[PDB]
Amino acid sequence: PFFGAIGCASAIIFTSLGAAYGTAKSGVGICATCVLRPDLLFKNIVPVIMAGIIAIYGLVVSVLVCYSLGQKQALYTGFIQLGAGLSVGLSGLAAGFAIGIVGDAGVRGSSQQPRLFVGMILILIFAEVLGLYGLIVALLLNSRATQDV
Amino acid sequence: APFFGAIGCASAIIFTSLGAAYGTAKSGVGICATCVLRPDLLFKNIVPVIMAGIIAIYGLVVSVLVCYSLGQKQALYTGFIQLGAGLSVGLSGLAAGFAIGIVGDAGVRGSSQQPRLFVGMILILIFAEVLGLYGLIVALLLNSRATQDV
Amino acid sequence: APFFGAIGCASAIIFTSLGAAYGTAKSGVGICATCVLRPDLLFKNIVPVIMAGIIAIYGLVVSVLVCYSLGQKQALYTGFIQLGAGLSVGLSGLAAGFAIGIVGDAGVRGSSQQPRLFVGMILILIFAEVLGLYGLIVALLLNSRATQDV
Amino acid sequence: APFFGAIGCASAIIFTSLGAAYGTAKSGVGICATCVLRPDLLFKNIVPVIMAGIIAIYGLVVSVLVCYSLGQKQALYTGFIQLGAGLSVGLSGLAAGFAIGIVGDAGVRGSSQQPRLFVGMILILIFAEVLGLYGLIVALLLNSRATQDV
Amino acid sequence: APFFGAIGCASAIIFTSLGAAYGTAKSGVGICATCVLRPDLLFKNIVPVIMAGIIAIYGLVVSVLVCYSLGQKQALYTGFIQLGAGLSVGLSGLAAGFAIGIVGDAGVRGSSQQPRLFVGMILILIFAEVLGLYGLIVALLLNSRATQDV
Amino acid sequence: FFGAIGCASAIIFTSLGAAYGTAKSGVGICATCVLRPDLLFKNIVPVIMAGIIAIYGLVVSVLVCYSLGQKQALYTGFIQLGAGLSVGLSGLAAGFAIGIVGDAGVRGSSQQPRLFVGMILILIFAEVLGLYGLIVALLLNSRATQDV
Amino acid sequence: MEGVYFNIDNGFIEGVVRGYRNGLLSNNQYINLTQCDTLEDLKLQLSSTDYGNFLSSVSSESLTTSLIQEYASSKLYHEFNYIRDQSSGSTRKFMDYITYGYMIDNVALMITGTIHDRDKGEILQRCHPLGWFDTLPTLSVATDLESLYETVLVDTPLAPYFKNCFDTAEELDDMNIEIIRNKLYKAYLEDFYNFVTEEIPEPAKECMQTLLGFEADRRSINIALNSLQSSDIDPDLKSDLLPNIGKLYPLATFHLAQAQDFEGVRAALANVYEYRGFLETGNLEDHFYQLEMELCRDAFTQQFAISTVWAWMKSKEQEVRNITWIAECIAQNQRERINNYISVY
Amino acid sequence: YTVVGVFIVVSAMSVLFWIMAPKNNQAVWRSTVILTLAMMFLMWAITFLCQLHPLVA
Amino acid sequence: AQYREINAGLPTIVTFPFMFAIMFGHGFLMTLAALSLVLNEKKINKMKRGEIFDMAFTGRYIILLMGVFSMYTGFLYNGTENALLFSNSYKMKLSILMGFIHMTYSYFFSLANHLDIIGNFIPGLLFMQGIFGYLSVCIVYKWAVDWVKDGKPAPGLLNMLINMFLSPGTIDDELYPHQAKVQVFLLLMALVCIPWLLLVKPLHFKFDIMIHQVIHTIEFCLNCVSHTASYLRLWALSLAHAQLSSVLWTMTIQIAFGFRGFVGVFMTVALFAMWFALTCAVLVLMEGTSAMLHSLRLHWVESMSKPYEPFAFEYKDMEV
Amino acid sequence: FFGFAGCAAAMVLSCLGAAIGTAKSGIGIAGIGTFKPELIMKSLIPVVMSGILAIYGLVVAVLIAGNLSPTEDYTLFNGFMHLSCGLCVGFACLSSGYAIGMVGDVGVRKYMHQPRLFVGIVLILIFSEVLGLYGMIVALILNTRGS
Amino acid sequence: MNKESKDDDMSLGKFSFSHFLYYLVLIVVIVYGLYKLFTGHGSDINFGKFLLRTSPYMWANLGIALCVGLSVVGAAWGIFITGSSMIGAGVRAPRITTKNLISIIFCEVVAIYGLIIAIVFSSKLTVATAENMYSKSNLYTGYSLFWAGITVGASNLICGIAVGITGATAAISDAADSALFVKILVIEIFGSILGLLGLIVGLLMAGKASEFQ
């Protein structure tokens, strides 16, 4: 065994890829929305900062899972961390993938009408429950991996 | 023993979070496009985002129950019912979110022009969530047999 | 044995939930467009989503019946008929849901112009449940012989 | 002794160099397209290439620090650590370079007609480098325990 | 021993030669003449071929350094530590060669019309050309400790 | 022993290439026959020329099938795969080339009777690749029966 | 990029497409023939090129306007219909899709001209998949959408004119030839983006994407400049969708299309092409011809690429229009004014 | 042994542009000698015999 | 951009050419080619040869100062270098101490401007001054570690990488052992700089500040690691250019002198001409690729100091 | 017997790269109506230059096949170095032929377009030939250091 | 062993999907099989600590028939685009497009090239032509004939494809038979000599694999 390091890095890699795709999808709609009028550029920056907050859960989960790692690697310490990191990584990647399209659609629709910032901010801000549930499942899965031989 | 049963608990929340993310994105795209033309239908069209995002609680509760039913020791035959129930709940939540997003986009686009299809659009989106409840019930029935071995 | 019979239980509800979600999305995509042309056909268009969603109960019933047969102990020959019954009911439910989606969308678009064409679209969706009924009967007959000991 | 962690040090600089090269190409395409219309924003738009190319220094310093902590005995407490620690910084640098490419191309194309979002694009890249820095911190934390294997 | 790790020296110039070939191939493509000639762009466009070929020049030195440290017969410890340096220079040389190819094609097409874009177009490939040396330094650092195996 | 698929691979590849060349020659002959009823006899050369390649794979499959089931070992089922792949690749390439060559020769011969001699010359000269591949399969099948 | 895939039909179709383009006339022959003014010298000078076979098949003692359209119409049938009969697969499907894309607006012009007492014999030469003896007489004479749906469905494969006929059957496009031509041009650009999106990653396409992207903005600027001072409708489909979403917008093309003196958007979008903000239609057409000619000469020399087939298809229509305007200008005993500047690009 | 002794010997026996300067360009001429001398001090070239035995391993 | 005296391009005239000349004796060709365009500037202005050579001919003082300063650092590399992992261990740690003086000089120059009536500069350069000060102090003490209480794994980045991860430890390795409180005082001084940065803004502003202090805190936190992380390009390009020059010179010098007679003059003349021809293009490629210090000094150095005023101010400084 | 796969697969990439480079370079010599002045005047350098890539893999495969023998030291197992030695020259010859084909097609296409940029296609195309020499030099250096 | 039927099944399955790729849409090659094979090989090769490789045993003979089959299959595909060029021209001119059939002789010689080496590479046996690992040792001599014949067959297929690719553009190539077509024929000869050079270098580097006993 001794292969739990890729599962530990997959939580920050999936949240970093989902946050990068959400920031790219937010900047893609913000680049087209900024061409119409330079009066709502500060309002469209909320999707990149909201999508970038999902990487802190995978980073703190990767640091907490890395802090409980033992000196001897075996089969009991290289199987639960892969699913625990893959759960928070896939949850942050799905939340970043939905936050990218939600930030792109809200950033594109926010150019013509500035009143959609409440609904786009609420629908875009309502995607953190998947990453929080994935980090909560990764904490419970990481809590049962102690005493590795 | 391998002790690799956490992939079944992670696959349920991964599939439910992916289906809820795709349904929330597909419902938020048509909700944003229909909300750009008029903001009065935002509160009526806001139900599909919560309905698509509510499917993640089944995979999160199934992963929490599968993680709570794991224990300190595992065997080789322990990681089967969690993988089947996790894959079934993940596929059911992904199909329910995929149908919920396409139903929410056409519901918001058709409801943007004339505000009369909200009864059928709310009934289709409220009726398409039964697959996640059936897969969560099958994941609970498969999870009930995982608290006796080991 | 490994006791890996959960894939046959989850494979029926996965393909059944995916085909039911695809059929409900296919009927909900055309229901919102057909509801704008005639307000009287709004309540009549809800029958294809409920008719397409009825095929999901076969994989949930076969997975719920096959879920109790696992238990804690297993063997080398127990766990093979459930995969064939689950994949057999899942493929027929996914194909019946996929054909029921395009048949419901084409039946709603053709029924939007004239009301006499709704009997053909309802007849195709009513006639497309024979594959799911035969696959559910074969999955029930295969699931009935799987439980012999324990 | 047997070890397989040698590819983990070289795997770290691959994703950051590929994402930095793709971000430099996507930023250079919009900078070259915007430099033809007005030569005043050409010197201002050149900062995102050098700012995007600084993400490879974290993977190169992590690869040099992981290569400096290499011992003479290979075991299970040294192998597989540099692959995940370098793979996390490589995937974070590849995602930050991939977002910096679309952010630089969209910022250069939107700033080509009317430059008003240059500080927003530079703040988007400066806020996008923190995703690579967060992966680099976990790669340094996992890379710090790659020595003393028995 | 196993005698695995000899492909690391030959694998170095593969991605670097493919990236330099893609950069030199993509640099000549594009508009270079419009009516009868260009504004001295023929003498300026020759820099991206040598700039893309610099990583291929360093890849032969890295592959020669790995080939000198390969040897006829060595232990399994030096073989596992020797492999891995070629993929780091190969991936960064391929990504920097692809970014130098796209930046050379866009800088050649945009530089064909206006000659003022060659200053930023040369600085884009000059700033993107360090990806091969950044991986070559890590490959030389890992290859420097692969000698004197026991 | 796994050389049973080698005897069927030659007739499978030659039947597939002859089927595709006969389909393209029949489509080109049917499309060229609508413009004039005099080119029907001239347009039938590509289907008859492409359909003659099945006899080499059938005779090679019968000859390779004749040495199976009586004398076989762990080293006697290797030549049938190379001979069947050899005749199958040459028959499949010659059928696909003879189909487009027959369609282009029928389209060029439909305008005037000038390209029909060139298409009939190339179609008559394209059988050397099938005969050279058939001679290697006959020479490989004739040299068998070495290890019991 | 290119040269890494194996294509059997693409090599013969690319060689047969490059063989007709190599034997065609050049800019030196058009510049030399444009300077001279004589009906007898035009037949002798034009006999050396590839059009000397069709022009030499039927000719009289005087220059006629009917023989000029019959020469390019006879050369277009052998240059376009001859390659489709000898080809098959995705190359013949894309080549038939391009001829169906040009036949979407070319058949729409005959369908709109059918109400004005127009037939198959009263239409000019245009790019199509077949001649006007199989599908053009029944499609041009057929005024009902039910017969045009079965006539378009009878051809293999399915063309994009069925959706335009279905949208035009309910009166969803326009009541004039302007809105039907703009919606047909936008649907033709959407179909070219659909086939160019489908068969895109066979080779490495670089000049085809820039030629289609510049041709979309040149077609939108030409459609907005054509309706300038014509009182066009801002809420009507007259703005073709382009790949640029940060330089050219639909509101700027719709506002610039109306007679309000709003040509500053073309000057803001300028500095990258041959067009510029002005008030002369001849200078805008000459700059649009030189802008469309850019990236077209590179496709005539490069081989093993899918963009060279579309660039040769547009270069055949541009060379047929330039040869028809050059022959029509000298056929009337006059000197070209706008065709002389656009004779070389 | 180190270059800190040579840089301390240069800094000890050197004013380092202190204190006055010329009239024309007194700021660049004043800080230029201190920046070049401080750049040379960090560029003192402290060679081997602290990390000697090169050409290893 | 109308600053005449300060502070736009004051430290860029020394920090620019000194840090730019470290990437490039190979510096004699840049000083000869840079000094050759002095008298021939009027005739070379109307020759019309190249676009980068015209901008290099306009900035004759920048290429003359950087070309003259590049010969000093270039002559030392091409200290000695005879093997691998010997010369790079000192040239790698030399760029940290070389860039730390310009980093502290930019903070002192930024702290000198705006002259409580001062603030927003006391918290900056406190965490990086402690971490980078202990890393530069460990690199300075690492070259004196003889006897055995020393080591070169690497030093520099190895001590800072091992530090900040163990409070109970003292140093690993080659650090000042007096005894363990260096990391505690560094972590306390770096952790105390968090509230003092945002707290010192309203006291220094007087005799919407929250978002500016948070964005300046995160931008200072990212630029503090990016500014120290961007220093590797000088030693990377210097070691790559020195290895690329010494490989061709060592691979051509031995073959040039062999086969005495006419073959040594012809083969040595052709090999020396091709070697010098490739060496001039390699030095021109490194000089063209040495703009990273100008870009990072123009954006990152100009962001914490105060624009294109330092580029014209650096050339206008040597002219007046 | 495992060492013969590298020598047999050594020139397989150089022959496929030189064949595609010669076919891609020869495919662009069709146009455009001038054969006396410029086609071929200086466009024959890529076709003849691309054929020299197979000689390095063929000579390296003949030297690697002649160097190894069944009675020599082959009980290691150390025969995996011949696969990297042959694949190193094969990938460099294939990339050099693939870049030489696109450089010859771009130089032949841009040669007839402008009469002033003819030296740029030759100067840019001349640098592409040095790519395949590194795999042959590394293959000969790896074969010289072995048995 | 198990690799005996897997090698023939994979060899037939690769040519089946490769031949079905250019055909009508009935089947297609699995692109995920390469990433699944690389991930499955690197995953099992990475963990655990063990040498992962293959072992050839006895057969060693598929390169002999595969060389002549690959040369005949490569030579048979070049004549399609070469012969279709003259029919593609048609009535455009009576020029050298009907007299440029010299490339078809080299394309027909490309099928004999490799097949002559495969015919001369066996004598006095059909099961084994050298020392095999079924009744003796020294199986490298019989093992190298498979890779040498596969390399010579692939080189003959590439030269045969390059000959037809040169001839199909080298039919007439300007507009007619007024300009000489020898410029494309020079590149066709330069891409035609690679089969003879690769066959001479592969035959010389391959060694002797006949007269087994």
**How distant is the Cα of K57 from the closest Cα of chain D, in angstroms?**
28
**How distant is the Cα of K172 from the closest Cα of chain J, in angstroms?**
9
**Three-state DSSP state, J74:** coil
* E strand or H helix that includes residue C9: helix C6-37
Q: Which residues contact G28 (CB under 8 A, 6 or more apart)?
A: none
Question: Which residue does chain D place closest to K49, by CA atoms?
Answer: D2
d(CA E92, CA E97): 8
Instruction: Count interface pairs F-G at CB distance under 8 A.
Output: 13
Task: Give the ranges where chain G is alpha helix by DSSP (H).
Answer: 8-22, 27-35, 39-45, 52-57, 65-76, 82-85, 90-113, 136-141, 145-154, 161-169, 177-198, 207-226, 250-257, 264-268, 281-293, 307-331, 338-341
- The answer to whether J77 touches J3, Cβ cutoff 8 Å, is no
DSSP string, I58-78: HTHHHHHHHHHHHHHHHHHH-
- The Cβ of residue J83 has, within 10 Å, a number of other Cβ atoms equal to 19
Fold of the domain built from segment(s) K21-206: Four Helix Bundle (Hemerythrin (Met), subunit A) (1.20.120)
Q: Name the packing angle between helices I209-229 and D129-143 (round to 10°).
A: 50
Contact residues, chain I, for D143 at CB < 8 Å: 161
> Cβ of G246 and D37 within 8 Å?
no
- Measured in degrees and rounded to the nearest 5, phi and psi for residue K25 equal -75, 95
- CA angle (G211 as vertex; G205, G212 as ends), nearest 5: 90
Contact residues, chain E, for H57 at CB < 8 Å: 144-145, 147-148
Nearest to G8 among K81, K85, K171 (CB): K81
- Residues 27-46 on D with a CB inside 8 Å of E are 27-29, 31-33, 35-36, 39, 42-43, 45-46
d(CA B132, CA B92): 5
> Cβ of K205 and J35 within 8 Å?
no
> Cβ of B84 and C10 within 8 Å?
yes
- CA angle (C81 as vertex; C75, C83 as ends), nearest 5: 100
**How distant is the Cα of D144 from the closest Cα of chain I, in angstroms?**
7
Contact residues, chain K, for F73 at CB < 8 Å: 127
- Residues 131-150 on B with a CB inside 8 Å of C are 131-132, 134-135, 137-138, 141-142, 145, 148-149
Longest dimension (CA), chain B: 61
> Cβ of B91 and C49 within 8 Å?
no
**Three-state DSSP state, K210:** coil
> Cβ of D127 and A69 within 8 Å?
no
- CA angle (H18 as vertex; H16, H24 as ends), nearest 5: 105
Omega into D106 within 30° of 0, i.e. cis?
Answer: no
- CA angle (K120 as vertex; K119, K125 as ends), nearest 5: 80
**How distant is the Cα of G26 from the closest Cα of chain K, in angstroms?**
13
**Three-state DSSP state, K27:** strand
**How distant is the Cα of K148 from the closest Cα of chain A, in angstroms?**
40
> Cβ of K46 and D2 within 8 Å?
no
H57 — contact with chain E (CB < 8 Å)?
yes
DSSP string, G296-325: TTTTTT--S-SHHHHHHHHHHHHHHHHHHH
**Nearest CA to G249 among D110, B32, A104?**
D110
DSSP string, E8-70: HHHTHHHHHHHHHHHHHHHHH-S---SSS--SSHHHHTTHHHHHHHHHHHHHHHHHHHHHHTT
Provide the domain limits for residue J103. Answer: 1-147
Nearest to J87 among E10, E28, E73 (CB): E10
> Cβ of K169 and G15 within 8 Å?
yes
Give me the amino acid identity at E20: A
Task: State the method.
Answer: cryo-EM
- The answer to whether J21 touches J98, Cβ cutoff 8 Å, is yes
d(CA A64, CA A56): 12
- The answer to whether B137 touches B62, Cβ cutoff 8 Å, is no
* E strand or H helix that includes residue A50: helix A46-51
Beta bridge partners of K25: K27
Resolution stated for this PDB structure, in Å:
7.9
J130 — contact with chain G (CB < 8 Å)?
no
Contact residues, chain A, for G245 at CB < 8 Å: 32, 35
**Nearest CA to B35 among J37, J79, B27?**
B27
Please report the beta strands in chain I, taking only residues with DSSP state E, as ranges in sequence order: none
Number of folded domains in chain J?
Answer: 1
Contact residues, chain G, for A32 at CB < 8 Å: 245-246
- CA angle (I267 as vertex; I265, I270 as ends), nearest 5: 100
As a residue count, chain F comes to: 148
Q: Which residues contact I188 (CB under 8 A, 6 or more apart)?
A: none
Contact residues, chain A, for K46 at CB < 8 Å: 3
Q: What residues of chain D have any CB closer than 8 angstroms to a CB in chain G?
A: 33, 36-38, 106, 109-110, 112-113
Query: What residue spans define the domains of chain E?
Result: 1-150
- Residues 45-84 on A with a CB inside 8 Å of D are 45, 48-49, 52, 55-56, 59, 62-63, 66, 69, 71-74
In b/e form, how buried is each residue of G149-179, taking b as 16+ CB within 10 angstroms?
bebbeebeeebbbbebbebbeeeebbeebbb
d(CA H27, CA I76): 30
> Cβ of A3 and K48 within 8 Å?
no
d(CA D10, CA E132): 12
Any contact of A with K, at least 3 CB pairs below 8 A?
yes
F116-122 long-range contacts, CB within 8 A, separation 24+ = F116/F42, F118/K83, F118/K86, F118/K87, F118/K98, F119/F45, F119/F46, F119/K83, F119/K87, F120/F45, F122/K79, F122/K83, F122/K104
Q: Which residues contact K33 (CB under 8 A, 6 or more apart)?
A: none
The chains in contact with chain H, meaning 3 or more Cβ pairs closer than 8 Å, are: E, I
- The answer to whether H6 touches H44, Cβ cutoff 8 Å, is yes
**How distant is the Cα of E63 from the closest Cα of chain G, in angstroms?**
27
- Residues 35-74 on K with a CB inside 8 Å of A are 46-48
Nearest to I229 among D43, D46, D58 (CB): D58
D119 — contact with chain I (CB < 8 Å)?
no
J34 — contact with chain G (CB < 8 Å)?
no
First-to-last C-alpha distance (Å) of chain I = 19
- The Cβ of residue H24 has, within 10 Å, a number of other Cβ atoms equal to 8
G15 — contact with chain K (CB < 8 Å)?
yes
Two tokens at H14? 């050197």
Contact residues, chain I, for H49 at CB < 8 Å: 146
- Measured in degrees and rounded to the nearest 5, phi and psi for residue K27 equal -155, 160
Contact residues, chain G, for D112 at CB < 8 Å: 246-247
Nearest to E44 among I50, I55, I84 (CB): I50
**How distant is the Cα of K87 from the closest Cα of chain G, in angstroms?**
9
d(CA D67, CA D65): 5
Two tokens at H53? 């035995």
d(CA I299, CA D47): 7
Question: Which residue does chain G place closest to D112, by CA atoms?
Answer: G247
Question: Which residue does chain J place closest to E43, by CA atoms?
Answer: J120
Any contact of A with J, at least 3 CB pairs below 8 A?
no
- The answer to whether I285 touches E50, Cβ cutoff 8 Å, is yes
**How distant is the Cα of H56 from the closest Cα of chain E, in angstroms?**
8
> Cβ of F24 and G86 within 8 Å?
no
d(CA G89, CA G97): 12
**How distant is the Cα of I166 from the closest Cα of chain D, in angstroms?**
11
Residue I3, class by beta-carbon neighbours within 10 Å (0-12 exposed, 13-18 middle, 19+ buried)?
Answer: middle
Give me the amino acid identity at A12: I
Question: Which residue does chain I place closest to H2, by CA atoms?
Answer: I144
